[PDB]
């Protein structure tokens, strides 16, 4: 008999590292279905925020406008939502951007000569030779340009390159940074890699003490199997670290003497943020959506 | 075509349907090519078992009523080949559950003994799974082939 | 061309690695795999982004119409 | 109230009233396998699957045969009903650990 | 009600490329004559060489519509025995004079009895339960 409240008696969370960007945690004893699911959102559900419109003045550069505007569109942008709303389609494009739904960052370089002495470095030999991602200057406009006061729009990542120019060649946009979610472009995923794996599960089927034991413990990783002495058998120390290579089958002397397989009701998450979110916040709103996507199913009328 | 005369010959006469089997030897030119061919002879194999909710999905997986696929407007299962210790159906059952929601309920079940490209010696000792056996529309024994 | 931006297999951001590879393989003389490492690049498919580049860029911006010889 | 989300298929929903089908528009395995997980939960729930006719098309098909005593409408209610409270159990659990940290 | 009970002495147990399932050879401690060959389910119910088996054929258990899963207070002729199989007879098969072996299929675990005096209780049946003990 499963009961929601006999769930939350053997059900367990262990976090392992939690970093500004990656965390590392554990779902003990919840079904795969749960755990397929969050994950499954944690890269789908979890929309951002990026460019979307790029509007070109003038484009000297070898980089073709498609490209450049393409490019300008995959640079994260240090930008929390939340702060800006869903843009609607339908309404033209007069009524279609404003303060509460669009974000504008302006590019505006020209390349020049510099006297130097002479393989020499382009930024000796030119000037604005190389466009970066911290070249894109924050334009705020309309009802809200007070909001982003202690919040000014920064490129994630500043010292990507953009572009590279020779002198006489220009860039001159206005791009239009909107709302997304990440299964329409790449260009809107919040996190880099959302991915679990099952506890590796060793079962010890006979005590192969001695030598044989020194045999074993390195057909598994450093950190794993864990000899008490010469005889007191051959135990598991840490089981977690495995990499699951299953290079003590292809051995004669153990083939039948040890059995390998998981535990099911264990998974080891990893989640990686893009640097928008802060991994914890991806997988809470993970379980907000499981959640939200069965409350609306819950209230809501089953026609025909 | 652009009318009702041709719509009629496109449907009964040069339709897709009756051509099951070519004029040239009387045999069949139609039937499942590779995939399929190898999933039968695991999903057909004895090692091959299956839980109630396994089961069940695999029948409606491929069954549905909606796209009229059943002939009885109820999907219609067998009881378990294992009771205890755990609930469990074989694969061979699956086909039986196939045949027994898409025949005519009016009409017995179909009687066949053929054979498989299989040869019994790679299914190990004293086995008979080279043998298909059809009784009253039930799988009872051999694997299913491209034969 | 140019060192593309995120990893095409994960995504994660490579194109900020490029220059910083090079100053790694002349500067710190060290080897390809080691130069890889200290720029956080542990996945195989992060890991041949960059080391597989090109940088044609290079070659092709030495023809330039817009300035004399 | 938009109509086009849930609907009952007449064509297989039985006379009266344990067995039928539910179609659910813009819907896949996400919400599919967890609703047929808990639905079979359910003591009066006989026979429980779900099936997406073809992946080109946003469309989720549920099928819900009950014994008596309760319909196959009530089936999915109470599904639903109780995906809501697990989902505040794993909610409550998560909040919990996080400041136990 | 019961159409078969005795005790067998298990000769072989042989896996034939199968992780598992597995024959079973095995001879009558009370008949001489009376011979089994039985495919199990070793996983759920392993079987040794040199074993005692309590082999039982059942009509069923003490108008049924159809199985359904166990729920509190359910008395059957199952708790009594560890291993329970439904399965068909499919063939009837006369071996020289007097000596009679029948076959049995609990979906492709097949099983085949000789004997003699089992001929009137015995009947082809597409309904007959096969529980095992100890
Ligand atoms: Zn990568």
């Given at each position: 008999e499963?009961?929601?409240?006999?769930?939350?008696?053997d059900?367990?969370?262990?976090?392992s590292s939690?970093?500004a960007?990656?965390?590392?945690?554990?779902?003990?004893?919840?079904?795969?279905?749960?755990?397929?699911?969050?994950?499954?959102?944690?890269?789908?559900?979890?929309?951002?925020?990026?460019?979307?419109?790029?509007?070109?003045?003038?484009?000297?550069s070898?980089?073709?406008?498609?490209?450049?505007?393409?490019?300008?569109?995959?640079?994260?942008?240090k930008?929390?939502?939340?702060?800006?709303?869903?843009?609607?389609?339908?309404?033209?494009?007069?009524?279609?951007?404003?303060?509460?739904?669009?974000?504008?960052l302006?590019?505006?370089?020209?390349?020049?000569?510099?006297?130097?002495?002479?393989?020499?470095?382009?930024?000796?030999?030119?000037?604005?030779?190389?466009?970066?991602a911290?070249?894109?200057?924050?334009?705020?406009?309309?009802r809200?340009?007070?909001?982003?006061?202690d919040?000014?729009?920064?490129?994630?990542?500043?010292?990507?390159?953009?572009?590279?120019?020779?002198?006489?060649?220009?860039?001159?946009?206005?791009?239009h940074?909107?709302?997304?979610?990440?299964?329409?472009?790449?260009?809107?995923?919040?996190?880099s890699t959302?991915?679990y794996?099952?506890?590796?599960?060793?079962?010890?089927?006979?005590?192969?003490?001695?030598?044989?034991?020194?045999?074993?413990?390195?057909?598994?990783?450093?950190?794993?199997?864990?000899?008490?002495?010469?005889?007191?058998?051959?135990?598991?120390?840490?089981?977690?670290?495995?990499?699951?290579?299953?290079?003590?089958?292809?051995y004669?002397?153990?083939?039948?003497?040890?059995?390998?397989?998981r535990?099911?009701?264990h998974?080891?998450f990893?989640?990686?943020?893009?640097?928008?979110?802060?991994?914890?916040?991806?997988?809470?709103?993970?379980?907000?959506?499981?959640?939200?996507?069965?409350?609306?199913?819950?209230?809501?009328?089953?026609?025909? | 075509?652009?009318?009702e005369?041709?719509?009629?010959?496109?449907?009964?006469?040069?339709?897709?349907?009756?051509?099951?089997?070519?004029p040239?030897?009387?045999?069949?030119?139609?039937?499942?090519?590779?995939?399929?061919?190898?999933?039968?002879?695991?999903?057909?194999?004895?090692?091959?078992?299956?839980?109630?909710?396994?089961?069940?999905?695999?029948?409606?997986?491929?069954?549905?009523?909606?796209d009229?696929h059943?002939?009885?407007?109820?999907?219609?299962?067998?009881?378990?080949?294992?009771?205890?210790?755990?609930?469990?159906?074989?694969?061979?059952?699956?086909?039986?559950?196939?045949?027994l929601?898409?025949?005519?309920?009016?009409?017995?079940?179909?009687?066949?003994?053929?054979?498989?490209?299989?040869?019994?010696?790679?299914?190990?000792?004293?086995?008979?799974?080279?043998?298909?056996?059809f009784?009253?529309?039930?799988?009872?024994?051999?694997?299913?082939?491209?034969? | 061309?140019?060192?593309?931006?995120?990893?095409?297999?994960?995504?994660?951001?490579?194109?900020?690695?490029?220059?910083?590879?090079?100053?790694?393989?002349?500067?710190?003389?060290?080897?390809?795999?080691?130069?890889l490492?200290?720029?956080?690049?542990?996945?195989?498919?992060?890991?041949?982004?960059?080391?597989?580049?090109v940088?044609?860029?290079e070659?092709?911006?030495?023809?330039?119409?817009?300035?004399?010889? | 109230?938009?109509?086009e989300?849930?609907?009952?298929?007449?064509?297989?929903?039985?006379?009266?009233?344990?067995?039928?089908?539910?179609?659910?528009?813009?819907?896949?395995?996400?919400?599919?396998?967890?609703?047929?997980?808990?639905?079979?939960?359910?003591?009066?729930?006989?026979?429980?699957?779900?099936?997406?006719?073809?992946?080109?098309?946003?469309?989720?098909?549920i099928?819900?045969?009950?014994?008596?005593?309760?319909?196959?409408?009530?089936?999915?209610?109470?599904?639903?009903?109780?995906?809501?409270?697990?989902?505040?159990?794993?909610?409550?659990?998560?909040?919990?650990?996080?400041?136990?940290? | 009600?019961?159409?078969?009970?005795?005790?067998?002495?298990?000769?072989?147990?042989?896996?034939?490329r199968?992780?598992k399932?597995?024959?079973?050879?095995?001879?009558?401690?009370?008949?001489?004559?009376?011979?089994?060959?039985?495919?199990?389910?070793?996983?759920?119910?392993?079987?040794?060489?040199?074993d005692?088996?309590?082999?039982?054929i059942?009509?069923?258990?003490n108008?049924?519509?159809?199985?359904?899963?166990?729920?509190?207070?359910?008395?059957?002729?199952?708790?009594?025995?560890?291993?329970?199989?439904?399965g068909?007879?499919?063939?009837?098969?006369?071996?020289?004079?007097?000596?009679?072996?029948?076959?049995?299929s609990?979906?492709?675990?097949?099983?085949?009895?000789?004997?003699?005096?089992?001929?009137?209780?015995?009947?082809?049946?597409?309904?007959?339960?096969?529980?095992?003990?100890?």
């Amino acid at each position: 008999e499963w009961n929601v409240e006999k769930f939350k008696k053997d059900f367990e969370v262990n976090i392992s590292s939690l970093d500004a960007r990656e965390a590392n945690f554990d779902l003990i004893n919840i079904d795969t279905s749960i755990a397929n699911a969050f994950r499954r959102i944690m890269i789908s559900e979890v929309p951002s925020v990026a460019a979307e419109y790029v509007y070109f003045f003038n484009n000297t550069s070898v980089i073709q406008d498609e490209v450049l505007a393409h490019r300008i569109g995959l640079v994260p942008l240090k930008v929390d939502p939340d702060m800006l709303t869903w843009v609607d389609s339908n309404l033209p494009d007069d009524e279609k951007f404003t303060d509460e739904n669009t974000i504008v960052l302006s590019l505006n370089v020209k390349c020049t000569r510099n006297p130097d002495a002479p393989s020499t470095d382009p930024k000796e030999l030119y000037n604005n030779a190389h466009v970066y991602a911290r070249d894109l200057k924050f334009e705020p406009q309309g009802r809200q340009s007070t909001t982003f006061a202690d919040c000014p729009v920064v490129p994630a990542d500043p010292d990507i390159l953009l572009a590279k120019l020779r002198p006489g060649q220009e860039i001159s946009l206005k791009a239009h940074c909107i709302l997304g979610i990440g299964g329409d472009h790449a260009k809107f995923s919040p996190v880099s890699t959302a991915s679990y794996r099952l506890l590796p599960q060793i079962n010890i089927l006979q005590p192969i003490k001695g030598e044989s034991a020194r045999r074993f413990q390195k057909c598994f990783p450093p950190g794993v199997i864990g000899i008490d002495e010469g005889s007191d058998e051959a135990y598991v120390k840490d089981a977690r670290k495995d990499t699951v290579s299953r290079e003590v089958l292809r051995y004669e002397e153990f083939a039948d003497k040890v059995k390998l397989g998981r535990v099911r009701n264990h998974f080891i998450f990893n989640v990686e943020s893009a640097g928008a979110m802060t991994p914890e916040e991806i997988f809470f709103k993970s379980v907000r959506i499981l959640k939200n996507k069965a409350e609306y199913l819950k209230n809501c009328p089953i026609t025909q | 075509p652009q009318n009702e005369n041709a719509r009629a010959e496109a449907l009964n006469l040069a339709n897709t349907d009756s051509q099951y089997l070519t004029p040239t030897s009387g045999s069949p030119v139609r039937g499942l090519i590779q995939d399929h061919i190898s999933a039968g002879v695991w999903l057909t194999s004895k090692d091959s078992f299956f839980t109630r909710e396994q089961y069940q999905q695999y029948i409606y997986g491929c069954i549905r009523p909606e796209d009229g696929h059943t002939t009885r407007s109820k999907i219609v299962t067998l009881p378990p080949t294992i009771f205890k210790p755990y609930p469990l159906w074989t694969g061979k059952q699956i086909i039986t559950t196939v045949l027994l929601n898409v025949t005519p309920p009016d009409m017995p079940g179909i009687n066949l003994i053929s054979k498989n490209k299989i040869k019994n010696e790679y299914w190990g000792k004293g086995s008979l799974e080279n043998e298909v056996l059809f009784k009253d529309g039930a799988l009872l024994c051999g694997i299913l082939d491209k034969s | 061309m140019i060192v593309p931006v995120r990893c095409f297999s994960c995504g994660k951001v490579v194109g900020d690695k490029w220059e910083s590879y090079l100053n790694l393989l002349q500067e710190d003389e060290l080897d390809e795999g080691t130069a890889l490492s200290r720029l956080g690049l542990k996945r195989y498919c992060c890991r041949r982004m960059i080391l597989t580049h090109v940088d044609l860029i290079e070659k092709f911006l030495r023809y330039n119409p817009l300035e004399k010889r | 109230p938009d109509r086009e989300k849930i609907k009952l298929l007449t064509q297989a929903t039985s006379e009266d009233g344990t067995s039928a089908s539910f179609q659910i528009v813009e819907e896949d395995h996400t919400l599919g396998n967890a609703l047929r997980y808990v639905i079979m939960k359910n003591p009066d729930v006989e026979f429980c699957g779900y099936s997406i006719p073809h992946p080109s098309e946003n469309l989720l098909n549920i099928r819900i045969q009950t014994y008596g005593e309760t319909t196959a409408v009530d089936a999915l209610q109470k599904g639903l009903k109780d995906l809501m409270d697990l989902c505040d159990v794993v909610e409550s659990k998560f909040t919990e650990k996080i400041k136990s940290m | 009600n019961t159409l078969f009970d005795d005790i067998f002495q298990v000769s072989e147990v042989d896996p034939g490329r199968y992780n598992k399932v597995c024959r079973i050879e095995a001879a009558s401690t009370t008949q001489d004559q009376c011979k089994l060959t039985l495919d199990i389910n070793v996983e759920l119910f392993p079987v040794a060489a040199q074993d005692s088996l309590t082999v039982t054929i059942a009509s069923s258990l003490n108008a049924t519509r159809s199985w359904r899963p166990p729920q509190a207070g359910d008395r059957s002729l199952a708790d009594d025995y560890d291993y329970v199989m439904y399965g068909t007879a499919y063939k009837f098969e006369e071996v020289s004079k007097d000596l009679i072996a029948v076959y049995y299929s609990f979906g492709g675990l097949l099983m085949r009895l000789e004997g003699n005096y089992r001929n009137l209780n015995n009947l082809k049946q597409e309904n007959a339960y096969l529980l095992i003990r100890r």
